[PDB]
Short mmCIF file of C-alpha atoms and ligand atoms in Angstrom, two decimals:
data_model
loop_
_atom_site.label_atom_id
_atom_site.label_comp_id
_atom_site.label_asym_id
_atom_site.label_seq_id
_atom_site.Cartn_x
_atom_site.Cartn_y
_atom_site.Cartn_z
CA UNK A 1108 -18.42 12.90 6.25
CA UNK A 1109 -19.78 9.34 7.53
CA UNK A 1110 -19.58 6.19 5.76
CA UNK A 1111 -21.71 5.51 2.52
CA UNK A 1112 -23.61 1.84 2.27
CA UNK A 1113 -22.59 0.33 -0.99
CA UNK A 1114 -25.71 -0.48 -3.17
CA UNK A 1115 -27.04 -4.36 -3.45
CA UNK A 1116 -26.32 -4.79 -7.21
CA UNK A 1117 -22.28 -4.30 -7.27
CA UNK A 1118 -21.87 -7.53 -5.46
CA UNK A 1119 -24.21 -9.32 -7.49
CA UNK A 1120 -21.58 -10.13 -10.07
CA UNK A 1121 -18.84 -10.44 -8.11
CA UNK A 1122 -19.84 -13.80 -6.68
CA UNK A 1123 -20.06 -15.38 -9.23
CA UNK A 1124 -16.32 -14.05 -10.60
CA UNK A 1125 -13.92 -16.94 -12.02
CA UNK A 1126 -10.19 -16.55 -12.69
CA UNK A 1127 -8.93 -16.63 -16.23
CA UNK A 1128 -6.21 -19.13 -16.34
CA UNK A 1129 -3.02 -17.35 -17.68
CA UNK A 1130 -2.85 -15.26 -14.56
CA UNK A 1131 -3.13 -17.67 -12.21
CA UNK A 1132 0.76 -18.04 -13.01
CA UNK A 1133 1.07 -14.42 -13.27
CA UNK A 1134 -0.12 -13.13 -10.33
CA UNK A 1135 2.41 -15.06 -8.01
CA UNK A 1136 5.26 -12.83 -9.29
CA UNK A 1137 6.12 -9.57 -7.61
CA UNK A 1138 6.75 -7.66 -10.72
CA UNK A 1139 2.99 -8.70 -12.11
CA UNK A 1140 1.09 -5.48 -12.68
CA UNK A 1141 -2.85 -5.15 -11.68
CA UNK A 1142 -3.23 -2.30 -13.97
CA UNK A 1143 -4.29 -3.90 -17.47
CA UNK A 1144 -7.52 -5.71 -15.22
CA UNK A 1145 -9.59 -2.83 -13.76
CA UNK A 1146 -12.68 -5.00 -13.62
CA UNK A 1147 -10.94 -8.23 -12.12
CA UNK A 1148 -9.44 -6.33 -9.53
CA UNK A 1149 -12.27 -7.10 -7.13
CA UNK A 1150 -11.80 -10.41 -8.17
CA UNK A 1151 -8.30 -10.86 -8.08
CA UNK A 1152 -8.29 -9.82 -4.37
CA UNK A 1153 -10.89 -12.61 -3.51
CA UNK A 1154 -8.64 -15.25 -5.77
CA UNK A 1155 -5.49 -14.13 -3.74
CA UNK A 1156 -7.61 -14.36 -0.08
CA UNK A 1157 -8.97 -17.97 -0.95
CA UNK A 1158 -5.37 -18.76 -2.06
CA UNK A 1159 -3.61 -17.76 0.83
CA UNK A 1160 -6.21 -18.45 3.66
CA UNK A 1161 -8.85 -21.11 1.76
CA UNK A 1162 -11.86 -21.24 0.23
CA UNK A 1163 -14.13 -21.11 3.39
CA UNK A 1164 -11.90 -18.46 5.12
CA UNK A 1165 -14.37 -15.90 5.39
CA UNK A 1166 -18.25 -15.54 5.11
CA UNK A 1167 -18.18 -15.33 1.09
CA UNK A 1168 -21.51 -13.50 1.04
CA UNK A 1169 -20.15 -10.75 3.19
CA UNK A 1170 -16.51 -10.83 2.35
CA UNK A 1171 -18.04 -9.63 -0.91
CA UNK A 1172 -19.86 -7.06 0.70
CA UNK A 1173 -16.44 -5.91 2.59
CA UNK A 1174 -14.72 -5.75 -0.79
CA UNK A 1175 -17.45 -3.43 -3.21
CA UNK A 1176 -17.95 -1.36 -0.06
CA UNK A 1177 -14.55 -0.94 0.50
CA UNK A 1178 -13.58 0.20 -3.15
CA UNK A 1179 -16.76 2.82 -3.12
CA UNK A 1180 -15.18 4.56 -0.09
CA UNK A 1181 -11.83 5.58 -2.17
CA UNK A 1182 -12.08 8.88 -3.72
CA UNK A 1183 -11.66 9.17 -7.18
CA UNK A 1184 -8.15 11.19 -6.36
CA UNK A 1185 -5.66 10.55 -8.91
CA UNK A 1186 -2.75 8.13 -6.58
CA UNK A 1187 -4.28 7.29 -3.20
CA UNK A 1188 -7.14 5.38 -4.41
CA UNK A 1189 -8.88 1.88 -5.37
CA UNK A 1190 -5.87 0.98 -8.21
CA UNK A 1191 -3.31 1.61 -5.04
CA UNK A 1192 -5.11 -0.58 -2.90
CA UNK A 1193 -5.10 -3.46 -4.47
CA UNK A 1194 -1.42 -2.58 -6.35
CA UNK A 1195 -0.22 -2.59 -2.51
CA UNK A 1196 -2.52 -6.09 -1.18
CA UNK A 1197 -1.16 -8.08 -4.16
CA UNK A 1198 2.44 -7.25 -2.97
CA UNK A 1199 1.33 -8.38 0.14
CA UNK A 1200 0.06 -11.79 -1.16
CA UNK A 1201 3.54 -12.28 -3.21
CA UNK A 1202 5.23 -11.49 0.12
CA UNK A 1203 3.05 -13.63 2.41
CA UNK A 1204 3.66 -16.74 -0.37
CA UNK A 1205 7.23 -16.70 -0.23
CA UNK A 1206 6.80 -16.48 3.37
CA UNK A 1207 3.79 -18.46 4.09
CA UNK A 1208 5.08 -20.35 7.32
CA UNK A 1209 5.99 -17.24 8.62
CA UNK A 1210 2.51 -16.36 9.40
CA UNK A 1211 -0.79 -17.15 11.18
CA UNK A 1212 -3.99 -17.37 9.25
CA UNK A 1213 -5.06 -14.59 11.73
CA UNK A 1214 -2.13 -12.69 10.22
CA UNK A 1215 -2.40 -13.52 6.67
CA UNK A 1216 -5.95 -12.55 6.05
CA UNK A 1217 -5.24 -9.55 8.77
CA UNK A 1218 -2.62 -8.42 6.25
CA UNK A 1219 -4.28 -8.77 3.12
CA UNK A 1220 -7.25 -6.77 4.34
CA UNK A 1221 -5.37 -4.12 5.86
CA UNK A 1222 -3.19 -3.46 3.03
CA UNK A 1223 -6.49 -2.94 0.80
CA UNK A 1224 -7.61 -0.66 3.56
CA UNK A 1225 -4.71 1.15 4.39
CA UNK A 1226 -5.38 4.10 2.28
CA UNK A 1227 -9.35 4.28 2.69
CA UNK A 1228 -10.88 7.79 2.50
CA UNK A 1229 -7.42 9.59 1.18
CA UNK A 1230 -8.59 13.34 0.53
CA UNK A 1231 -5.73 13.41 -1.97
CA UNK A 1232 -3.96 15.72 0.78
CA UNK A 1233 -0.86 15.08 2.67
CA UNK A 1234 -0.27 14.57 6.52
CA UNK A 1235 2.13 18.09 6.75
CA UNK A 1236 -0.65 19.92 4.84
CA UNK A 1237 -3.24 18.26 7.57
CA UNK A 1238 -0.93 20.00 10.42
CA UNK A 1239 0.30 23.13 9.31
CA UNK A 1240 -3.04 24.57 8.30
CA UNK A 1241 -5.23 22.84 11.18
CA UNK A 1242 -7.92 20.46 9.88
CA UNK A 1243 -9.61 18.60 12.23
CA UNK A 1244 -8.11 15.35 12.08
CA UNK A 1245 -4.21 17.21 12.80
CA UNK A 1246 -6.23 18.08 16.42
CA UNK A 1247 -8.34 14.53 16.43
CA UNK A 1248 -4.87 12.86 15.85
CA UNK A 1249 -1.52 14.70 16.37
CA UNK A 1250 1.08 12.31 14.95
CA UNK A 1251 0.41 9.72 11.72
CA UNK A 1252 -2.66 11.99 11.12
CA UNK A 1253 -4.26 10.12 7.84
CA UNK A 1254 -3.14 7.12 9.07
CA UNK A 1255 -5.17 7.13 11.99
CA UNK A 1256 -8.94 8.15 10.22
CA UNK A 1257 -7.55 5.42 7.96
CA UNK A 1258 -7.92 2.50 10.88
CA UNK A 1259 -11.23 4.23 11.89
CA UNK A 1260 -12.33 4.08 8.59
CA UNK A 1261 -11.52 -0.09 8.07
CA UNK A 1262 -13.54 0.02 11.58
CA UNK A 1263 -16.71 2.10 10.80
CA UNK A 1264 -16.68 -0.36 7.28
CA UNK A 1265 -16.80 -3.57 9.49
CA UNK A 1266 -19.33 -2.07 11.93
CA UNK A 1267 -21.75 -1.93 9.24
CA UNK A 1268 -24.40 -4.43 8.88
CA UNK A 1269 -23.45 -7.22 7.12
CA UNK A 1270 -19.74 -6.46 6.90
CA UNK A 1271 -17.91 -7.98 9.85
CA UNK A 1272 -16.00 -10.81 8.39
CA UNK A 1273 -13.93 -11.27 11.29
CA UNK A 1274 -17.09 -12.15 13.51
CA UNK A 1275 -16.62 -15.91 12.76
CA UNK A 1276 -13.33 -15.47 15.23
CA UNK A 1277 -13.10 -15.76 19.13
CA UNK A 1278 -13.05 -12.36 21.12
CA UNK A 1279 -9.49 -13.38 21.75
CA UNK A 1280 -8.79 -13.58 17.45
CA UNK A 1281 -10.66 -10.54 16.95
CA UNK A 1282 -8.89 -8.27 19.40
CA UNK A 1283 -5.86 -9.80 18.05
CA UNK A 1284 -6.44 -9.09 14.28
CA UNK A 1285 -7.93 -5.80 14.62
CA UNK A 1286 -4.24 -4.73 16.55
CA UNK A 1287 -2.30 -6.31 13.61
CA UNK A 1288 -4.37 -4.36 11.13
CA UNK A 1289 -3.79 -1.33 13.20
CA UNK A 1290 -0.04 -1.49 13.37
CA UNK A 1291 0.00 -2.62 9.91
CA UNK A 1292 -2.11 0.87 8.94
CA UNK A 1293 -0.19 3.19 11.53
CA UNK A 1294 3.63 1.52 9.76
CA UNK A 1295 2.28 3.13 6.21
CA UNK A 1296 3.22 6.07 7.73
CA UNK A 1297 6.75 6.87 6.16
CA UNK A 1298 6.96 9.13 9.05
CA UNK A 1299 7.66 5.64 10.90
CA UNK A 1300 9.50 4.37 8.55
CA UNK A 1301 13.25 5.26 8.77
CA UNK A 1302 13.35 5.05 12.17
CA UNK A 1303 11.64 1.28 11.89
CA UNK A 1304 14.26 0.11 8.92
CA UNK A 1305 17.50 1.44 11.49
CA UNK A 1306 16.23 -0.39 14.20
CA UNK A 1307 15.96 -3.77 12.14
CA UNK A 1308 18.66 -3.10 10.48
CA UNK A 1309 20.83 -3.06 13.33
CA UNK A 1310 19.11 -5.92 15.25
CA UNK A 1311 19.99 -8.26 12.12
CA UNK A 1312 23.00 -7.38 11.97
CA UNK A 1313 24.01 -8.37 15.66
CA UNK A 1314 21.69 -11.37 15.33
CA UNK A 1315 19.19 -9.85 17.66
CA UNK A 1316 15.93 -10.55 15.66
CA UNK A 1317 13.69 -13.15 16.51
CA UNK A 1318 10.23 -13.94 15.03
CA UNK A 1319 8.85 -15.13 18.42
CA UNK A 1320 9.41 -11.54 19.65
CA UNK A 1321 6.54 -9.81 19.60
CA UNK A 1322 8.16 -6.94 19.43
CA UNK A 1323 10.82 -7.81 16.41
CA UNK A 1324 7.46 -9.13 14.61
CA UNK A 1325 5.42 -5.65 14.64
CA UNK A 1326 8.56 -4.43 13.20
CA UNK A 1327 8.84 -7.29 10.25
CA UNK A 1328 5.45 -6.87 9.36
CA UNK A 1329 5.98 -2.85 9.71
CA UNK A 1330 9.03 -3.27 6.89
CA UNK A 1331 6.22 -5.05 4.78
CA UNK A 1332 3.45 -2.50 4.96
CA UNK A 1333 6.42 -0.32 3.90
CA UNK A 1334 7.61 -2.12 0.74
CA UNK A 1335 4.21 -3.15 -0.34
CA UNK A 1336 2.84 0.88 0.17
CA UNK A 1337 5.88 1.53 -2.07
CA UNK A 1338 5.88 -1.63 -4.90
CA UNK A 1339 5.24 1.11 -7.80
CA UNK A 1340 9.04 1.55 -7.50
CA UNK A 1341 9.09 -2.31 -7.95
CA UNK A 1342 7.32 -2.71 -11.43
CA UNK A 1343 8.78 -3.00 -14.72
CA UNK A 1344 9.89 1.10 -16.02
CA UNK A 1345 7.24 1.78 -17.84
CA UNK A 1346 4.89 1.40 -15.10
CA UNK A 1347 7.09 2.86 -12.73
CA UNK A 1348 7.16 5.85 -15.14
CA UNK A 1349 3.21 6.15 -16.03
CA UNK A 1350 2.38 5.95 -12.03
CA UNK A 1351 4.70 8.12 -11.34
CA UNK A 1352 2.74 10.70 -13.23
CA UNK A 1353 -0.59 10.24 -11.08
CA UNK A 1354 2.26 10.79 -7.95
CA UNK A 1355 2.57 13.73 -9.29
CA UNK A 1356 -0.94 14.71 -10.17
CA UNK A 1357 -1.94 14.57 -6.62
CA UNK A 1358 1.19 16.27 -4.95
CA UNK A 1359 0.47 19.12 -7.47
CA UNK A 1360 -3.04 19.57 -6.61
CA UNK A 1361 -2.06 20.13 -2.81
CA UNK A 1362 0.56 22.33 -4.48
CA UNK A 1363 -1.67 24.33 -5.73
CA UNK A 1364 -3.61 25.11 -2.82
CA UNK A 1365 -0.66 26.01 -0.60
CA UNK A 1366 -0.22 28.49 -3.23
CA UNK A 1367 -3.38 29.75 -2.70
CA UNK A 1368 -2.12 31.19 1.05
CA UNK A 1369 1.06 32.50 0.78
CA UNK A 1370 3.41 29.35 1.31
CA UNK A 1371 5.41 28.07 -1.17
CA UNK A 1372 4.81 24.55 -1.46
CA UNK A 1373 8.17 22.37 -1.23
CA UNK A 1374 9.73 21.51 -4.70
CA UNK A 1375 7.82 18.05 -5.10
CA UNK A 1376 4.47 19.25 -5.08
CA UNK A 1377 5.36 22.45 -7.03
CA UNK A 1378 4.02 21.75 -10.99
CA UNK A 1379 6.16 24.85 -12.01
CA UNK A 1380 9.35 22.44 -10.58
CA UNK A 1381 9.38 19.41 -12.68
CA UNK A 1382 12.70 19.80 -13.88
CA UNK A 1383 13.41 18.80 -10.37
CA UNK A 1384 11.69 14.89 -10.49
CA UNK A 1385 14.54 12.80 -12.04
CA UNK A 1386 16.67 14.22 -9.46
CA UNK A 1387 13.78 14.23 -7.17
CA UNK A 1388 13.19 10.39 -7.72
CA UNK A 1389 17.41 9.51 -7.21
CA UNK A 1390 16.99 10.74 -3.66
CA UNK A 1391 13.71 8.81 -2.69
CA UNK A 1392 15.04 5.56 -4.09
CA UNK A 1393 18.70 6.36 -2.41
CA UNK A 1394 17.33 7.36 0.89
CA UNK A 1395 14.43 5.62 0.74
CA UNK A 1396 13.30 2.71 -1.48
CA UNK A 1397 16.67 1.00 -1.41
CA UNK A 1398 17.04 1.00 2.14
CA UNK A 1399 13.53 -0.17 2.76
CA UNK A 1400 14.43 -3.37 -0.21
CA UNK A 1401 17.47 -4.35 0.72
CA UNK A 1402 16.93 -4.45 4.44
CA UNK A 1403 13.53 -6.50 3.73
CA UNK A 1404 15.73 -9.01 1.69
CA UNK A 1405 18.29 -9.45 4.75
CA UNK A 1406 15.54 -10.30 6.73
CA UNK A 1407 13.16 -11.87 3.83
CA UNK A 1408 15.45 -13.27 1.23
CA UNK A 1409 12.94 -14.80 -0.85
CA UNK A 1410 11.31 -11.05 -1.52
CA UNK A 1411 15.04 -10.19 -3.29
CA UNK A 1412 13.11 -9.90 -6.75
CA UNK A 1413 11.56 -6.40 -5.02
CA UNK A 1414 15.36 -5.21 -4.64
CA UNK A 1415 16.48 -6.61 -8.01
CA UNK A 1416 13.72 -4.61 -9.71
CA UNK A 1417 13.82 -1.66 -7.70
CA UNK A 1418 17.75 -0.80 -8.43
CA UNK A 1419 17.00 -1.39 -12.33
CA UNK A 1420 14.30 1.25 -11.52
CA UNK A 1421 17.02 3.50 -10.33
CA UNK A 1422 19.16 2.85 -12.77
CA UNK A 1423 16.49 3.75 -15.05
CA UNK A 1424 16.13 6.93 -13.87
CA UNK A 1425 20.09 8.16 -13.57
CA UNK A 1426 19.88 7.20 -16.83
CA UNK A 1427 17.10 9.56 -17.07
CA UNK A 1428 19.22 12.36 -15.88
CA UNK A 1429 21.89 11.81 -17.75
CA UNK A 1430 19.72 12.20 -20.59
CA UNK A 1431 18.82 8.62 -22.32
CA UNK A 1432 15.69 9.44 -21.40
CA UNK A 1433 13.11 6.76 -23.77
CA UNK A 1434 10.11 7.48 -25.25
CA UNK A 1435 6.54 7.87 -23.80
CA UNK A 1436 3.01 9.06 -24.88
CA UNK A 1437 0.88 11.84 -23.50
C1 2ZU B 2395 5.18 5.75 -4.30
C2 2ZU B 2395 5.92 6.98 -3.82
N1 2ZU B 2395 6.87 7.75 -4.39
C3 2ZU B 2395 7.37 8.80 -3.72
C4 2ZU B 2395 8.35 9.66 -4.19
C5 2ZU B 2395 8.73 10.70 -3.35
O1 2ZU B 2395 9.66 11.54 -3.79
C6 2ZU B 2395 9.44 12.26 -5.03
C7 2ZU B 2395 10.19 13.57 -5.08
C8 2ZU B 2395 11.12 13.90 -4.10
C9 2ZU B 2395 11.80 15.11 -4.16
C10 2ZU B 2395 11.53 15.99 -5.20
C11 2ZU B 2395 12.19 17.21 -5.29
C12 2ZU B 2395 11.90 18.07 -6.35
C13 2ZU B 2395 10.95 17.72 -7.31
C14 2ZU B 2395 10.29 16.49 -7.22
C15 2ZU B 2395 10.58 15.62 -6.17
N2 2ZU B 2395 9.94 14.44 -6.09
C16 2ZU B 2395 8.21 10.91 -2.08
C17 2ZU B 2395 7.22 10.05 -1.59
C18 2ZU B 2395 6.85 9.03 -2.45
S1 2ZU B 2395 5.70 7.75 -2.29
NI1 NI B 2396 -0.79 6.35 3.08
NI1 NI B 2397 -0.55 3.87 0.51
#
């Protein structure tokens, strides 16, 4: 499809964006929802970069550029889009706070921009659909699939002119940041995941894990890309509930085009099946969520609010099936 050139007179306004002040206490909580600001967001991004790397981190008048060009190349598909990526990058930024020492610069701003990037040019379309019915990519990359044309994506958007905002870093920095993004991409993968939480898991619990290592590091900042991809489970019920629905929305739509050749799409993206969610949602959070929380406070304890609000969100919902179910509007 190639990569689109974002016109001249989007970033016109964002330079010259201030930050209203009653967020500027909000946004450092994890629970804080982006949602109610759909024209800060590209704002609130740049506020959350200058906070957590300075002012003169990157080239403002292309860092900009980076941003509005970034946001045009999400599709307009109902989950995996613009609202996601900055939902997951402002987890990130809570995260890297109550971590900052943890963390190089290089890292940091790495991080942030990979999270916002981490879902760029989502069809909307899962990575099983990709391989079972052959598209391209499945054959261009065999494992992680989306992943994958998600890196090369970030990539062709910094290759453009004007956009490199790492270019202001050594040869040694820039081969060094581009890795961390792509691990941090590649770890989005739930694919990845379980195996990655086991692993740490068991390493912290024999005392094994050390920051220093390399190795125990990719795997830290994997567990982040993980509980950052996933925060919607973190956010007060009724947001939980409402972006649940877009979930939905898009697993559907794929749904309803493995209908369309004979194979009967698994219960979760099957519309005619939503009896099926409440239950649906105990499992993810059971096998899932929870694991990937509590494991993350273990070896992050100040990130524990992401746990605490993630078991109220599964408490919400077995109170769901049990059938205190509370009101909402359609
Ligand atoms: C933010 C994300 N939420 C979920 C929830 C998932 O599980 C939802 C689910 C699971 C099993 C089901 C079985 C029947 C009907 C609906 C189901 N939904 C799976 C991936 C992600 S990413
Ligand atoms: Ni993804
Ligand atoms: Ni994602």
């Amino acid at each position: 499809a190639g990569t689109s050139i974002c016109t001249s007179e989007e970033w016109q306004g964002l330079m010259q964006f201030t930050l209203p002040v009653r967020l500027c206490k909000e946004i450092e909580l994890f629970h804080f929802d982006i949602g109610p600001f759909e024209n800060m967001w590209p704002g609130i991004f740049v506020y959350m970069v200058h906070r957590s790397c300075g002012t003169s981190c990157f080239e403002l008048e292309k860092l900009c550029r980076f941003i509005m060009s970034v946001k045009k190349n999400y599709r307009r598909v109902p989950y995996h889009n613009w609202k996601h990526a900055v939902t997951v990058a402002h987890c990130m930024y809570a995260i890297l706070q109550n971590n900052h020492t943890l963390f190089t610069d290089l890292e940091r701003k790495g991080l942030l921009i990979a999270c916002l990037c981490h879902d760029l040019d989502h069809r909307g379309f899962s990575n099983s659909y990709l391989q079972k019915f052959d598209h391209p990519l499945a054959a261009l990359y065999s494992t992680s699939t989306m992943e994958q044309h998600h890196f090369s994506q970030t990539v062709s958007i910094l290759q453009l002119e004007g956009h490199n905002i790492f270019s202001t870093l050594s040869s040694s920095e820039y081969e060094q940041v581009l890795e961390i993004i792509r691990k941090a991409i590649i770890a989005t993968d739930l694919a990845l995941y379980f195996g990655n939480r086991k692993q740490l898991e068991e390493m912290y619990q024999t005392g094994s894990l050390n920051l220093n290592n390399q190795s125990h590091r990719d795997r830290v900042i994997g567990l982040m890309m993980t509980a950052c991809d996933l925060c919607s489970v973190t956010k007060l019920w009724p947001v939980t509930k409402l972006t649940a629905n877009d979930i939905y929305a898009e697993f559907w739509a794929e749904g309803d085009e493995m209908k369309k050749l004979g194979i009967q799409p698994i219960p979760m993206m099957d519309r005619d099946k939503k009896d099926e969610v409440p239950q649906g949602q105990l499992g993810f959070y059971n096998a899932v969520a929870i694991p990937c929380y509590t494991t993350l406070t273990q070896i992050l304890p100040p990130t524990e609010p992401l746990l605490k609000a993630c078991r109220d969100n599964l408490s919400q919902w077995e109170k769901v099936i049990r059938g205190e179910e509370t009101a909402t509007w359609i």
